[PDB]
Enzyme design. Structure first.
Site, short mmCIF file in Angstrom:
data_model
loop_
_atom_site.label_atom_id
_atom_site.label_comp_id
_atom_site.label_asym_id
_atom_site.label_seq_id
_atom_site.Cartn_x
_atom_site.Cartn_y
_atom_site.Cartn_z
N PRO H 12 29.59 28.89 35.36
CA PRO H 12 29.80 29.74 36.53
C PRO H 12 30.83 30.84 36.27
O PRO H 12 31.74 30.68 35.44
CB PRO H 12 30.29 28.77 37.61
CG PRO H 12 30.67 27.48 36.90
CD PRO H 12 29.89 27.48 35.58
N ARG H 20 35.35 43.73 37.31
CA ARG H 20 36.56 44.01 38.11
C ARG H 20 37.63 44.64 37.21
O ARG H 20 38.01 44.05 36.15
CB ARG H 20 37.16 42.81 38.87
CG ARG H 20 38.44 43.28 39.56
CD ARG H 20 38.93 42.60 40.81
NE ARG H 20 39.45 41.31 40.38
CZ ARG H 20 40.62 41.09 39.75
NH1 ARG H 20 41.46 42.08 39.46
NH2 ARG H 20 40.94 39.85 39.43
#
Lengths: 152, 151, 149, 148, 148, 149, 149, 148, 151, 152, 151, 152
Positions: H12, H20
């Site tokens: 994940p 970002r």
């Protein structure tokens, strides 16, 4: 035997929250006050030539300062430190510093309550410990102190 | 008292307490477990308390005596000695017969080795006395009378 | 004519099984063979050896009580009671007879609960993992302490 | 099929079953359980013997006496689960396969009860199914010994 | 019988034996011990060599030099028992069987002393029997190597 | 005509692999063979058995939600989710259907993280290490609790 | 003509034994074979490699002190000193040369004391269990960090 | 040589790489990494497939689908390293050898991150070498499978 | 003093303290272990204290220097640096020769990683100084003089 | 060098039981009082242009309130919290809240006593710690504070 | 407000909260998660806060919703329910998108089992509310408005 | 609905060091005082027919004695015990002994600070806990108390 005991000077110290005894739902949990207990303990002591003084306090310093004032004036201490058993190293070091023997008393059986309550900064240095016997634990500590000081 | 109901009290002592008073009496004290139970029997008989006593080094003999106490005994005083730290079976005996008890130790266990701080009995006892010597038995007896006679 | 040492050898539970399961797979030696051999070796040194093995905790405790002022030294293999008997610890402290602790197997190589002993800290010392000669080393060691050689 | 020799061992305090507040906790005794289990075993050509004891040594010495007489052990060691390394070493030393049974769910009681000196060497463990745990262990032993 | 080649290794601080308050703690030196042990070994056709050191590396490199020269090691690692994984990996890497000896009962001293990086791979461990622990380890090594 | 029990059997991750790797080395039996056998044994007792196995945590949780007031009893082998799913614990507490926990293998003999369960303490009980018969024992046990025999 | 990297490879205790016990049972490869191979691979990339293996804690520390403003990067297999040498941790922090930590074996599969490192948390990274290629991966990784590719 | 079938699995939050503060933390995406790794594999007759997922079940079911199709797995389980026993049991159950990769040095971050349910059964572990950790794992897998 | 008895004091410094003042002097400070031991030697000579010093990265050289101190030294000041946390052998050296010591650390270890809270020396030292820099050596010297001269 | 130091304002705080020093078996354990120590420390400070104020107390609030009163009036604190080292998070947060640097002093070597005594709610934030050196530890903390404030 | 900037707030609820109000409404209370999110939406709309909500039993659906929030959301309110104790992946999702959040629990976890004391989220949250029921969501909303509008 | 609420009597208790709020580098860390917070909380309470009393103290006994005085006079407590959360069993047993429901409030998020700060002798008995929301956590506890006492 054919000889007279000097007067024991005994100090009873009670920690925080013990002034609440007898006050909450007396009809549900019991009506007896710390005062009724100290009064009956004073009478039991005076029968045996024990002069009993008592302080109860919510304030840690008042117990510590009373132990320091006890030096060379008191032969024995009975203490119910209540919640300070678990937290006051100061009190431990006050009793070690004046070097007066004591017995530790709890009304309730702390071993049946939360597990933090199983650890005492006092039990290991106490002459002994009484837990769970209610008010009569004070009378047992008094009988025990007289026995140890009079070798009887 | 041709006043009060007779309390039936069972006193149980664990392993090694049979040695009291045997080794270096002149160094460690003269008193035997016998002397203690005789004095405690006299104290109980003045209060209309019928005292019966078993000491044993055998775990099984304490457990089977607790079994035999069911519906015959009102209260137990027990010094389990070393078995405090090790006998889940004694704990399960006292819980199965559901007679209230007080645990007594002659020495202050809190001042000895740290394994001795742990009890499979303390949390279920009505209370615990440590470090007061033989008089701890007489305090437990006075406490049992107090609880059962409401006094 | 050194003085006769009175030595008590105590064996704990399950040591009666030695040599008996798949003897041709695990070794032939019984506890009997060991105690016989040890008795003979003791008698050559004016050591009077007596022995009790038991699966009953109480019989080891009661034998230690009965040893008070009859026995100079104890050799004990408590086997599984090493890990669980506070009562045996208190019996040896109560009679104050010096002992040595012996284990046939190396307990430190086995399950990690076997690393803790309620006896090792009060023993005069500890022997592990040398098999049956551990009893003979404990015997030689006790003679050494008592005859101050 | 060959007759299986099965030994059931029950640890301390289990003789108390049925006896205190029978109307509140159950009226069923260890006796009722072992009688029913003996009948169930005999229908399957399983010769069941039983010992219950408060004495650790009687369980150990029974395990010693079982060597080369017994095919399988079912044991409810009750409190000895948590404390008897000696029983662990007796079952390892005789090398008879066993199953561990507890009447109650030990995982729901005090956290010392979560640890067993036997669970890791048992063929299997049954907790909390009451007296039928004994009958499950018996069916399981038959299955492994008769490969079924 | 074949001549056994035995190596005795002694760890730090053991050179101090006999020296401080000889009248109070014993007058016996590491020297007296190794002399007596060499004599005992020579009576049994055991060729004993010895190294004592305060230097971890000298013990490790001696274990390396032992490979295919030595049948058995007796080691008193003294404080290195508690701290030297490197010694553990040296003995595992040369795969010579060894016995661990301590003069004092370590189980009676501070609780850090209860842990060893060697005890679990040693053939055996002797604690608290003083200098005779060395002679026990020697008798034990002879027994395993000569099957007696 | 006792009442029809509605029983839900839930299997956790990786149990779909049973019988499939080196079948002639590890055993032949599939999860399918087990659930078929269990369905037949249930139908003889007027037990309507439904089954979900899944590698998806969410599908086991959502099936337990959907079981509320349709199911009398759950048999669950959570496999690896025993050790890690608080969410499944909270699903079984939230719908308050009694269950029994089953494991084919003896987890107490395997790695020590496998000793802890977020379910064992709220289960009616636990069966470990008896292989596929554990499901059949759980079924017999659920009938016993529900039919008060 | 990128700049010449000065790289120091440090090996800890017992790695001198590689390939030497039962070579036909455990593998043939010596530390020598590894360092030769690594030196050749470095020289193809204009990396000047120097090497010290030692069983002496002090020699690794003193070599790290001497590396200050001579060395761009360290590759270290501390072997057993990973678990025990705070002093080596403080030597690498004191000279502030980046390093990568390499182990031939997978320590996480071995005894549980081997899981803790006094170095892993300050290393640029860690390679375990890939054998001798771990050194070659550390070398490729150091070139990558220093040549910002 | 035979064509190796290699599966790369990413756990994940790894889909976030590059996105970002690209100018502050790196502009490089999981995409850039897997494209480069596929090219590197194809030069060595390694057929590489990839799955990245935020869903535990998709990684487990991909490992099931790998049985008898795949020679080797490289996995960066990201946070699932610390929590998924189910992934451990999936890799054990299909018995495909794997290597564990982490981009960052986990030993330098919070101390819960030091524990893995995978590290002990992996062939090997690479931490903190950034995207080249994937290429190291690939070179390592080729080496073990082609004995080189 | 042609007043007092000469104290023989041994100062021992552990690994990595040889690096003091070397890396980014303009960032972390300019002072070397040399500068510290010279200033401490001058302070000790004014008080009729004979100071001898060894720094080492070698565990063995500290242990063998402690051995050689027996019946020659009255007191030890030791900054064991990393060896505080790891050397049971240094602890056993100081206990075997039974010379009193003071443990000194330049930095406050209690504010660094938590493994650094643990010492195989602190419990046997006559006392411990942390976090006061180089002056910690001069405090240990003043303390040793105080204890040995009763002042 | 050729420049004058401003006056340091330094506060010495002593925790519980330290008023007992010099009082129990002076003939056995030593005759020196907390007062003799503070007096000698005050004199040593005043030689170096340090103005020293002192409070000893058994009462945790009196130490906390003194630290709050110290804000913008004191440059440095020396504290021997005695048993409060082990138990007072309040004191920790009083010293963090006023942000005055301090040194922690113990007379005894706490690392040699019970193992509870090894843990401090202060040591980690202290500029440094001195244990086991007796009364002179106060003089070391004072020398250390002057050094850090005068960069000498 | 045709006064203030619109805050975009995401409310995330974890597993089993879909059950609220379902089982023994007459024993445990009548209120559904629906009723709570409707009342919270009305409270937010009066303050120019745009509320969007996801409840799920699926770990993945919360993580992917956090991913999709990047550069669209100003703040998160999350009741992770059981996933507080187990999901490092949710922690790593919130750290990767770097949107501030508040963690809410309806019950007082500190009074339930001791495994429930541990959170992989609490240490990174801007703050935590436990035990205040449904109003905990409205406190978190009032807090987010306070922080983002400096009021 | 068509019925009037009696007046709630609510006691706010603040522990040690909270008197420092607004005082250190107000320009850096914020200018708001405990007084500005209690004043705004008192006004918010009085709008809703809540009579609010407040004590802040560095002294553990003053909080304990105020809780004992609360018995049969106060319906609800809001407490920020500050550092006493981690150390005062006395306070726990004062609140259990008078049996008045309370909510625990911290300004800061203690879960982000040292790990000792994660453990409370209060949280487990509190009706609930609010951490990290600044001054508004007091207003949330007040809104929560009104809701629970008025079943609204």
């Amino acid at each position: 035997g054919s000889h007279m005991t000097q007067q024991i000077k005994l100090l009873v110290l009670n920690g925080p929250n013990l002034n609440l005894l007898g006050q909450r739902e007396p009809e549900v949990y019991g009506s007896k006050t710390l005062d009724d207990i100290i009064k009956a303990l004073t009478d039991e002591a005076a029968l045996q030539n024990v002069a009993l003084s008592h302080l109860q306090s919510n304030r840690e310093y008042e117990l510590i300062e009373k132990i320091h004032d006890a030096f060379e004036k008191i032969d024995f201490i009975i203490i119910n430190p209540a919640a300070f058993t678990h937290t006051s190293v100061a009190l431990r070091d006050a009793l070690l510093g004046v070097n007066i023997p004591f017995i530790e008393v709890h009304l309730s059986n702390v071993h049946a309550r939360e597990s933090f309550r199983h650890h005492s900064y006092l039990s290991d240095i106490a002459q002994g410990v009484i837990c769970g016997l209610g008010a009569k634990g004070y009378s047992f500590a008094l009988q025990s102190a007289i026995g140890k000081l009079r070798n009887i």
